[PDB]
Amino acid sequence: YEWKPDEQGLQQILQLLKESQSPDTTIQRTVQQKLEQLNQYPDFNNYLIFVLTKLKSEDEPTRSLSGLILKNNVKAHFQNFPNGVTDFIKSECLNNIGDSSPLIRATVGILITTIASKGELQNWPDLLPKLCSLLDSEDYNTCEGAFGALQKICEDSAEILDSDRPLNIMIPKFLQFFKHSSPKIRSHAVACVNQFIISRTQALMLHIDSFTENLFALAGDEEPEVRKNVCRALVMLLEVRMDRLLPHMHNIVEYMLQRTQDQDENVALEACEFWLTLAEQPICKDVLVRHLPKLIPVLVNGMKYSDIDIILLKGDVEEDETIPDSEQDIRPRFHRSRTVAQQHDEDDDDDDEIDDDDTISDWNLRKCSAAALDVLANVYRDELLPHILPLLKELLFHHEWVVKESGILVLGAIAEGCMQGMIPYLPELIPHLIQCLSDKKALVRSITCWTLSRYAHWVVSQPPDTYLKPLMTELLKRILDSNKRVQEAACSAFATLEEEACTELVPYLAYILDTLVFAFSKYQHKNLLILYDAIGTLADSVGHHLNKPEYIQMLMPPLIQKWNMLKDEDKDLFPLLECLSSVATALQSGFLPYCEPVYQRCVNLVQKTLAQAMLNNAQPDQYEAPDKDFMIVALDLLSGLAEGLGGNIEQLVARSNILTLMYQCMQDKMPEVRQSSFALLGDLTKACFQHVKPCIADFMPILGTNLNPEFISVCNNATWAIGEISIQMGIEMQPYIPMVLHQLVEIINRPNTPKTLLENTAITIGRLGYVCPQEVAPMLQQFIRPWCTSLRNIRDNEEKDSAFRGICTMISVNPSGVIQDFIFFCDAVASWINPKDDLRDMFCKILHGFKNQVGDENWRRFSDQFPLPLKERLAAFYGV
Amino acid sequence: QVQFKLVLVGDGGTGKTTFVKRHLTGEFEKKYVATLGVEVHPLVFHTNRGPIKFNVWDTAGQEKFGGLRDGYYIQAQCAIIMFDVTSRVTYKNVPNWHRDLVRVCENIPIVLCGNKVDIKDRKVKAKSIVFHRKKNLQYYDISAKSNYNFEKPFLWLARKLIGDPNLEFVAMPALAPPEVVMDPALAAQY
């Protein structure tokens, strides 16, 4: 009669809570937060679990009895308890405990509080934690059903416990019980307890390891139901201290290589995945006998499901090549400021693994057969070669696609580890795959592509017509027509085929080119972006070779077409400009009949972005925030023109204000911009120093300030830029040595510094020294070691050449500064294949210098203990 | 033609309120005017299997409604656990929602979304996202900003609900009434 006309008010607030909408929202939020003041009713208007359910609604009551209730934990978590400490109010609900069954749903809608109201009152670990045992083995069938009331809480222990020697020696005699509740016929009662009787750490890592019985009491504990045998097959292959597995181990692998097979897909994933977790070596002593015991099942998983096949086939049916690409399918793309680097012969992994943007979504089994098979070339190699052929021999024609595909996949799936040994059959497979590409197996051509390329390296390191000519012929037919899925797999592949053949494609240019040029007329947005990338790659590979009227004349028109079509805000500019940026460098001077506007666009973009920034900084309300990426891309393209046109760009620069735009960019508050400008100052310095020189007194100190390894990439380009500047101005460099030399010698000896930064630093120090021997020479013993160690691995070229001219020069001014480490230099010298006679004669002197230091016999003997190649090169430089 | 209980959990600010706004609006909307009373926006997609009523429960991440935690998760049919790739935390302050969700709804389908991938400064690299692979959900890089994959969560949810992998939304406009479409074109003169 008192709070009775009020409780029938919650039966009303739940008729708005449950069925909530905009009004009820911002409106009911008042009534719900005004009933937290007259707290003489909530402490009562809560028991409403078997009161409100057992009153009117069901779904609605549970939304307060299980609903609003939980919102009080917030009133105890956020309070420290001085509010409501009351133990009746505490035991009033700690009494609802023995009410585990009023509609199994509501049979837990309160049991999570038993975790909350224990984390905000952890002490007192026994008045409530008494139900622990006071219901523990109670689930042994003792309520509505047997467990359908007692079990509807046994699980509420897994949650309250795991989700929440003080008391380390008390709980042991309780958690050992859980092993019991296992052979029960009930699902929950089996698993609910089980997977939970496996969440182990250190809090009481006792009964655990000692159990070799819960190994076989489970090594046979198959599907007590279904949704459990999975969380079971989740724990065995879930451990680190495999001291006890070592024993029962040649069975776990047997009662597993099949539990990953159990038809219920969800299980196999929890198995296969958690299974092939081949950590350290010992995990392959077993895989030895397991060569045939798994390379049939996994292989037979390497095929798509009937549905992952459905979800695919969608945009598979070659007839979408004319369907526009949705804007919601254009993954955001950015521009990374160019980093000036060196080359190391035919020697990626530290760049391509930074882009696992897809696989992270579709985690079926297929992305785990091969995904776990990612060990049979990481742990061992060519071990699988034998026996797999017949699998992949029939597979390559057996049945329809699903299987053929699983074959063409596995093939490429292994080449990066089982290569050499595979190379043997390689001369027969390859010309075949080249057939697959020509099928009608749309989703098969895809992997035919990715696979061919997967190991085309070989096809290139072979005779032409044999197959590097036909491959590049059918691969190209795929670049076109087909479905868009094919098109991508196509290009991306060929894209790699290029980077490989580098300069060997030159013969079949006109051809390759017309394939690409036609694509621009058939490709959709999504693929067009890869088309751009393709071309830029082709250009980087072929080199100046691309500079010929016939080629240029058919490649530009399509690019110009795009160029005039994009707003200065369209992100496609990145791919397009990045492409150009390349092409422009390959056409060297041959791009002239195009540079003025390319140049102009860049300068203007930098000019617009710099402004857009300031305006946005001051009036965020009015002007939007510019994306500095357009500066970086433009800066990088100007840096590309200057390299290709080099010198011919003199005029353009003179009538523009890049030099002014430099002060602005080298001073920008964003690293990448700063990084790109330096790459430019460097190239400009090579092309038209005449125009830079006047600002050297300004710029120099700026660069000095940027030799801060706090942003290596910026440091890297500033370093290289100082190197090219010192060469353009000889001894007139003398005065700027102090504000640079120290930081350089510091970096060259800086731990954990990236190769490229050490190579440039080495090179620049070389140059400064080549210009001011007296100035840098006295400090030779402070860098000569990292200097050699570093430069010995760089390709001969202009840069390596100047650097050695400088060291050689300094060595003469201060021989004593290198004698001690004379073996380091020798190796560095012997890394040269063919050097200019000029420099070759400086080597000769320094060497004879060393001979004079150790004596004819020591030098004879030393000189001889070199592996053949070096041995001869050294001989050739020395002139007895 | 069916209503659905879709809870939009996820840390505060992550995008939830703009993300939904996107399917309702026609453009972005920057500001951050934190959500207080967990708002209920209704969404409807047109599929090859008919229409779909999705009642999006725009939850809150701030202590604006940080009071009413669960309660909506009650009798929920599907969930979207959203964070922020540009936020070190969020992806960390996440497994706390998967739980305070699986508690109530005990097996609804849930989609985990790394939002704001339209930013160069990606704090939570994809390679750092293994949750879904384990607690077995579905992942999607997305951007309420640009619309990248801004439909995938729903399509995957619908497909899981209705139980039809062949289901898809028909963005494609209408043409001639399917039952009057004339002979292929070649069947014309065949």
Ligand SMILES: Nc1nc2c(ncn2[C@@H]2O[C@H](COP(=O)(O)OP(=O)(O)NP(=O)(O)O)[C@@H](O)[C@H]2O)c(=O)[nH]1
């Ligand atoms: N660049 C970019 N900004 C985004 C993106 N998504 C959201 N934002 C911005 O991030 C801010 C917060 O978004 P909002 O939708 O309010 O987040 P919320 O998670 O719904 N807030 P609350 O937890 O309080 O309910 C807004 O300025 C919004 O425009 C995105 O994908 N890209």
Ligand SMILES: [Mg+2]
């Ligand atoms: Mg909001």
